[PDB]
Design a protein around this ligand. Structure first.
Ligand SMILES: Cc1cc2nc3c(=O)[nH]c(=O)nc-3n(C[C@H](O)[C@H](O)[C@H](O)COP(=O)(O)OP(=O)(O)OC[C@H]3O[C@@H](n4cnc5c(N)ncnc54)[C@H](O)[C@@H]3O)c2cc1C
Length: 456
DNA sequence: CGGCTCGCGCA
DNA sequence: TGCGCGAAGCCGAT
């Protein structure tokens, strides 16, 4: 609609209709932040043109029961901060409970909303909620990509087989879509308790908590401070202290040399566009700069591409034909070990390097990026079938990772087990032509003994 | 046809 | 640790 610094390719219409006379409602789901949020900015530009206020509506679902307290507290504390941030901009935030397909349509009718705006997510349940809302509303319904630097429907029109095909496409659109962010103007016009939704939710998740032997929780909640502000300092400390050595030590789990931005990036507490803008300006190691930019741009946004064009992104059917044929041929092969879900969960395998990886996931909620590949590939090696390996890897990833339930997860798991965005390797038993990792290969890359001792 | 985000042998 | 090769199937630039 209008705005000089607003690219119209970031916004697409889910439903046409007659503009209402009420405020513009932003259905915040994925990008939980006030700054550097295209969905909140575009909602504001429309409200300014229509001479109406803009309000933010957030629907708390029953989805937190599937996960644990570690993600629930991380999200809820971030929203408590966001409530204060929007209040200073004179933007009232409403927090609802229940099915978004029923609650959002009721709010748009109760509040007499004029236009509805939401952010983009390629997940299945988001597309289901939007279709339920479309049938219930009569006002226009727009969608804005505030997560990806290049809007997902613009970067490619089909499923990308590999990164070397997606890389030229994305880097060619960077001069257009890589731009600064204008400030969020405060509202000229005017018009549940999160402290209750937090206490009610923790009392429900308390039985499912991950514990020790003498009933002491394994999760250490002091490693990552949640919120928009703390995410800014994590990115600042990375670019100043850790980015120079990122290209050389990103695969060393004994060195805390990663950006640690994924939990904030998953919940939308910081914009990846903002991080790219600051890394692009920083004068650091040219090899390290390109290595990081390939992670936050190519591999992050191609994961949205994978989920957005493959609805069965968490299933065996999404695997490439060569991988499905190979894994099918080795279904009857004898496995060296067979472990259940509970044995993987408690870290009681024969491999101490795998066990230490699970210990890092249970204690900190963020396992080092290199060991995540070794972690998932050994699940496939020591399971009944490729389907049970996929089920277990997704279950443990979504239950204990702060960045779980994310397109980066289902794409990263499909890469590990189904060879998605990968290629074929030497033929083996059980795994077939899926890329193989070994305990001995990690020994010649990093001090395995230190990583094992660090996590029992 | 050339090139893709492991293990392996050898400085 | 850093390099160069090997084993593998397929995209896509023509
Ligand atoms: C088995 C497995 C499961 C995964 N599950 C998840 C998950 O649930 N949630 C999640 O956010 N990521 C997941 N990924 C990707 C990866 O684990 C994380 O992006 C990263 O390890 C988080 O640490 P970091 O942000 O400090 O890494 P950094 O090296 O600092 O990466 C910077 C950013 O680049 C992106 N990125 C990096 N590596 C990848 C990758 N392989 N694929 C896609 N994007 C990437 C992320 O946005 C990340 O925040 C998984 C990877 C594997 C191998």
């Amino acid at each position: 609609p209008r705005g000089s610094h607003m690219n119209p390719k970031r916004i697409r219409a889910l439903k046409s209709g007659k503009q209402g006379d009420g405020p513009v409602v932003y259905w915040m789901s994925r990008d939980q932040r006030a700054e550097d949020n295209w969905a909140l900015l575009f909602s504001r530009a429309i409200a300014k043109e229509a001479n109406v206020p803009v309000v933010v509506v957030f629907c708390l679902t029953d989805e937190f029961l599937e996960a644990g307290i570690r993600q629930y507290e991380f999200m809820l504390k971030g929203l408590q901060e966001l409530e204060v941030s929007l209040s200073r901009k004179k933007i009232p935030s409403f927090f609802l409970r229940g099915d978004p397909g029923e609650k959002i349509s009721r709010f748009v009718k109760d509040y007499n909303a004029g236009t509805l705006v939401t952010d983009f997510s390629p997940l299945r349940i988001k597309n289901q909620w939007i279709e339920k809302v479309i049938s219930g509303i009569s006002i226009p319904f727009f969608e804005v990509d505030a997560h990806n630097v290049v809007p997902c429907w613009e970067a490619s029109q089909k499923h990308e087989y590999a990164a070397h095909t997606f890389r030229p496409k994305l880097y060619a659109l960077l001069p257009e879509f890589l731009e600064e962010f204008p400030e969020l103007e405060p509202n000229s016009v005017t018009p549940e308790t999160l402290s209750d939704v937090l206490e009610t939710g923790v009392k429900a998740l308390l039985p499912e908590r991950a514990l020790l032997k003498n009933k002491d929780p394994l999760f250490e909640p002091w490693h990552f401070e949640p919120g928009e502000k703390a995410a800014k300092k994590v990115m600042e400390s990375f670019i100043a202290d850790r980015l120079d050595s990122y290209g050389a030590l990103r695969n060393d789990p004994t060195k805390n040399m990663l950006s640690n931005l994924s939990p904030y990036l998953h919940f939308g507490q910081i914009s990846s566009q903002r991080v790219v803008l600051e890394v692009e300006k920083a004068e650091s190691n040219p090899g390290s700069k390109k290595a990081f930019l390939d992670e936050i741009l190519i591999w992050k946004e191609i994961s949205d591409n994978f989920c957005y064009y493959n609805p069965g992104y968490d299933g065996f059917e999404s695997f490439p034909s060569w991988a499905k044929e190979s894994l099918n041929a080795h279904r009857n092969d004898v496995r060296s070990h067979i472990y259940t879900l509970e044995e993987f969960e408690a870290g009681k395998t024969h491999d101490p390097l795998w066990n230490a990886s699970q210990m890092e996931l249970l204690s900190t909620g963020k396992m080092h990026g290199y060991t995540r590949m070794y972690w998932a590939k050994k699940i496939l090696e020591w399971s009944e079938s490729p389907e049970k390996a996929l089920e277990i890897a997704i279950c443990l990833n979504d239950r204990y990772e702060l960045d779980g339930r994310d397109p980066n997860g289902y794409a990263g798991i499909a890469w590990s087990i189904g060879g998605v965005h990968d290629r074929a390797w030497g033929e083996r038993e059980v795994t077939g032509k899926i890329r193989y990792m070994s305990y001995e290969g990690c020994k010649r890359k990093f001090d395995v003994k230190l990583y094992i001792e660090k996590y029992s």
